[PDB]
């Protein structure tokens, strides 16, 4: 009952967080690259697909991918469509970091008040 239910709850809860963190880790990579190159970033369907098993150490076709915490988290977002863009993920529910709305498909690099920079900050705040 109570101790063991709690134990299972926490184990599951931890897997969820670990998955989400791993996703935000991939998203933070993309951003950091754009910042390093002084370039813009595309977070729409022209950016990377986050429902790629290879992003999480699984080969394509591996049947266990479908049973992964990553797939569990990603496929249950209201934005999931088989694919899932950065924007889809960030604006998708339910996840432990909530939702970002008013997201644009593209953030251009600009010398002053860098859009990509402002994107980086808000994602950074969510991935913490």
């Amino acid at each position, epitope marked *: 009952r109570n101790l063991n239910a709690a134990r299972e709850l926490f184990l599951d809860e931890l897997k969820a967080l670990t998955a989400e963190l791993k996703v935000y880790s991939v998203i933070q990579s993309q951003i950091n690259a754009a910042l390093s190159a002084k370039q813009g970033i595309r977070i729409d369907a022209g950016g990377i697909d986050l429902v790629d098993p290879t992003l999480y150490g699984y080969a394509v076709g591996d049947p266990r991918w479908k049973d992964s915490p990553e797939y569990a988290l990603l496929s249950n977002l209201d934005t999931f469509s088989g694919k899932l863009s950065i924007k889809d993920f960030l604006s998708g529910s339910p996840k432990q970091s909530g939702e*970002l*709305k*008013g*997201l*644009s*498909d593209e953030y251009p690099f*600009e010398k002053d008040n860098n859009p990509v920079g402002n994107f980086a900050t*808000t994602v950074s705040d969510r991935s913490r």
Partner: antibody
Amino acid sequence: QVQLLGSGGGLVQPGGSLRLSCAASGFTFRNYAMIWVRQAPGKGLDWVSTISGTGDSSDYADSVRGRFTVSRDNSKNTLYLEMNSLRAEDTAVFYCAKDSRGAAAEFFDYWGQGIFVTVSS
Amino acid sequence: AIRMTQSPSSFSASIGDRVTITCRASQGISSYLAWYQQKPGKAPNLLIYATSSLQSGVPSRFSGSGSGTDFTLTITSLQSEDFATYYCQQYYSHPLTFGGGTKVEIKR
């Protein structure tokens, strides 16, 4: 100075339409997600809609879904709220507001002065 | 909607009083809470974001704290020009929701 000059308010018949307008200056508008907030007489603040910087994404409170449309003109630096099928309950002051940081709609450092909407026959 | 329950809905205090406004969320919202001041017949002004980051230009007598579900706005030394209505606002998720507001009045 940062400014958001609102207009397009006023008196309208029940069932009628209005187009609220908010002209932005003093910041690079196209880099800020924006919101509309309403405040009914003697009531608190209610979020109405959100629009992304480029205007390629928008969200709405369930009560205005379908009958309100948010839009923006980034060349002219204008924010719009088209309002149709208006009800007495829509009578309120409307504020446009810019996100502090811009990339998403979260918390809002600049708010336009309220636009009065009265719905009455 | 994440419901934000603000309390109290109003109070009177003397100048110099320390005053505390409470905001409770219907679910966890981590730190994604902000506070606004609204002087009568004016648009709101941002006081605090991220639970406790003070907005540039705001006096330090305003401070925010909380975690998850319970949030507080403190005015540590109330002044005559603090007469306003104060709202909390969550931004953990959409729709963005605001507290009912606390009207602060001033005894003299």
